[PDB]
């Protein structure tokens, strides 16, 4: 009981230690990125210890480490609900972040603020662990906005870039709408159950939770970039590649999905919530796969891959399968960490060049990165017995075998086929064909700081799904008695997508121009949602603000109503009352009128 809590809070202490070293004025004498990388790997080992303990005895833990404040009949206490989800995501996130910071030490070389970057990544990791392991909604909300703000800073890392600042601002906006949904849910639970404690939420499982479930759904939509609130993720690709990987690929984007997994006992009792979660997830994975089919920037392609897999998780949470969603969280975290790290190595070797139209012959010129990229693409598509086979295939069988929306099922299968097709597009236009990059060869991937995190993430993306899924305690009973076309559905549609995209890429190789069609224009131009919404909603908002609020109300009509009207009235009265001609004749006539008036009031008063 002591070693478990000591290990968890030691993970937290080892996370907070490089921040104190950063503010303790000894960075100029030590190697801060290497020190932080060693700190994260040690945090991963002391995180591996309760992973083994929970895999043995399945002990479920609550730790109240610090009583913050007692507020009549409501105690805000800093507490951790050490879950299965909390333990496994802690281990996976620490392993991934160790890989990302080693890759960051390689990639952010010749950068004046490499220590600033490393400290920002560490602070983001601390906030993400707070969000993941938090027991009460206030602490989870602390983690939520800490992650959001550090995402803002890391997107606007290159603060001299107007596009980076704009992308960070709109990421803040969509995360803020998610925060509004979270605040609605938090306030409803505070009013109806006197606490933000998940135990009292579990006791709240047996009533109508429609309003707080709607709030949590809005919060998860904002955080996980589902449809309506999606484009902040592909805009958030603007920042550096390790930020892209760690933030937008593995840890932050699955926070809303993680929140839904946390509130899954409430989710199971509301059928309307389950149906709208399923429909929203199917729509967003279909739309994001459609967008991913025709992008040219490799980071944008794998970002829309991230959003489509998040839509798959959101579908899985539309089903009563939260543990499958969390397994896909860990699986997806591994895949996108390795894929993004490979893409960043490609970009650095090709000198900050990002779109796939100026790449090629990568299999021959960068064999290690090519092999790891092929591993990531195959395992993301769902090659059997890799890490993705133990989550994605079970999701496909679950949606094929349980009662769902038919259109959601169909577009989920088509989205999986599109996942195969854009993975083929990545493989073809990067690792195949002839070179298209500028001639000067500056490729040097022989750095150990580059190779070793990709090796660790390759071992993850090969074996971690198998090891984890065989170590999961049995829950959410799958169905295995099912027809052969339903059983091999995911593999069949993945092979079909690979073949279709291969022949389409060969048709692009064929020497003929074709007139573009509105389907490809819709897919390449982001579905027109960013252009249309980001032009009409800010214009109406700021136009209403300036034209009505400030100008009309404050600078015109409240001034015309109270103060200038009072001043004008008193000015008119004082001019009218002291426009005196200065004649004693008129003054004495006025005095006579006053005398007559006072006699009249005396006569009427008596």
């Amino acid at each position: 009981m002591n070693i478990f809590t000591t290990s968890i809070l030691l993970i937290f202490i080892l996370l907070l230690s490089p921040i104190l070293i950063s503010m303790s004025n000894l960075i100029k004498h030590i190697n801060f990125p290497l020190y932080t990388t060693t700190s994260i790997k040690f945090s991963f080992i002391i995180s591996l210890l309760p992973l083994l303990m929970f895999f043995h005895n399945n002990m479920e833990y609550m730790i109240t480490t610090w009583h913050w404040v007692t507020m009549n009949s409501m105690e805000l206490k800093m507490s951790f609900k050490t879950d299965f989800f909390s333990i496994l995501f802690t281990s996976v996130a620490l392993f991934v972040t160790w890989s990302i910071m080693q890759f960051s030490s390689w990639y952010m070389h010749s950068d004046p603020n490499i220590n600033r970057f490393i400290k920002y990544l560490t602070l983001f990791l601390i906030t993400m662990l707070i969000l993941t392991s938090a027991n009460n909604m206030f602490q989870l909300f602390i983690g939520w906005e800490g992650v959001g703000i550090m995402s803002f800073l890391l997107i606007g890392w290159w603060y001299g870039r107007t596009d980076a600042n704009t992308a960070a601002l709109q990421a803040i906006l969509y995360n803020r709408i998610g925060d509004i949904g979270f605040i609605l849910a938090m306030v409803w639970f505070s009013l109806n159950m006197n606490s933000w404690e998940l135990q009292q939420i579990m006791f709240s499982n047996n009533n109508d939770n429609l309003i707080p479930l709607m709030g949590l759904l809005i919060a998860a939509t904002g955080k996980s970039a589902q449809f309506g609130l999606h484009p902040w993720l592909p805009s958030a690709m603007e920042g550096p590649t390790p930020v892209s990987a760690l933030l937008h690929s593995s840890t932050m984007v699955v926070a809303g999905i993680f929140l839904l997994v946390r509130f899954h006992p409430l989710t199971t009792n509301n059928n309307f919530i389950l149906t709208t979660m399923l429909c929203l997830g199917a729509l967003t994975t279909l739309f994001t796969a459609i967008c991913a089919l025709t992008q040219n920037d490799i980071k944008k392609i794998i970002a829309f891959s991230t959003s489509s897999q998040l839509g798959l998780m959101m579908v899985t949470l539309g089903m009563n399968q939260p543990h499958l969603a969390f397994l896909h969280i860990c699986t997806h975290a591994f895949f996108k960490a390795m894929l993004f790290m490979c893409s960043g190595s490609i970009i650095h070797s090709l000198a900050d060049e990002q779109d796939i139209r100026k790449m090629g012959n990568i299999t021959k010129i960068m064999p290690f990165t090519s092999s790891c990229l092929v591993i990531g693409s195959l395992a993301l598509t769902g090659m059997p017995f890799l890490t993705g086979f133990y989550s994605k295939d079970l999701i496909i069988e679950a949606i094929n075998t349980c009662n769902t929306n038919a259109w959601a099922l169909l577009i989920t299968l088509i989205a999986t086929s599109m996942t195969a097709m854009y993975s083929m597009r990545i493989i073809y236009f990067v690792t195949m064909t002839k070179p298209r990059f500028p001639p000067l060869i500056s490729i040097n991937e022989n750095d150990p700081d580059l190779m070793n995190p990709i090796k660790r993430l390759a071992f993850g993306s090969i074996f971690a799904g198998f090891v984890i899924s065989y170590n999961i305690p049995p829950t959410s009973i799958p169905v295995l008695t099912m027809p052969w076309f339903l059983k091999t559905t995911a593999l069949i549609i993945s092979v079909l997508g690979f073949l279709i995209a291969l022949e389409l890429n060969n048709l692009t190789m064929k020497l003929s121009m074709n007139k573009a069609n509105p389907y490809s224009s819709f897919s390449t131009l982001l579905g027109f949602f960013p252009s249309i919404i980001h032009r009409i909603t800010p214009m109406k908002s700021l136009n209403l603000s300036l034209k009505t609020s400030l100008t009309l109300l404050d600078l015109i009509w409240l001034e015309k109503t109270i103060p200038k009207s009072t001043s004008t009235l008193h000015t008119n009265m004082t001019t009218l009352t002291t426009n005196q001609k200065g004649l004693i004749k008129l003054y004495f006539m006025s005095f006579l009128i006053n005398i007559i008036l006072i006699i009249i009031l005396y006569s009427i008063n008596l």
């Binding site: 009981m1 002591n2 809590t5 000591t6 809070l9 030691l10 202490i13 080892l14 230690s17 060693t38 700190s39 040690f42 002391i46 005895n57 399945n58 002990m59 479920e60 833990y61 609550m62 730790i63 109240t64 480490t65």
Partner: protein, 106 residues
């Protein structure tokens, strides 16, 4: 068309001054004027493990055992799984076994 002679001469003079400025941006070899390794397993990682882990582990263990277990409901854990045929360590009673399992086709 091409360069007019005035702007051509201006760019040549400006570029020559740019060459001079960029050459003057160089650093002399004395600038800036500033005012037990063993093996990695035995000193690089061992000292880190015994310094930045062991003392924090001591402090956390002290705080956990002497400021959380002394309080009632700080560390609350679920009941462990109890199976038939198991022996309870704390109580000492053995759980009776299951029924006869009529289906053994697989």
């Amino acid at each position: 068309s091409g360069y007019t002679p005035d702007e051509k001469l201006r760019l040549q003079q400006l570029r020559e001054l740019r060459r001079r400025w960029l050459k003057d941006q160089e650093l002399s070899p004395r600038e800036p004027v500033l005012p037990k390794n063993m093996v990695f397993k035995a000193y690089r990682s061992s000292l880190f493990a015994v310094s930045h882990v062991l003392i924090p582990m001591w402090f956390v263990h002290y705080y956990v055992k002497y400021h959380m277990a002394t309080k009632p409901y700080t560390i609350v854990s679920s009941k462990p799984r109890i199976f038939p045929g198991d022996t309870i360590l704390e109580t000492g009673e053995v759980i009776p076994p299951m029924r006869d399992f009529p289906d053994q086709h697989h």
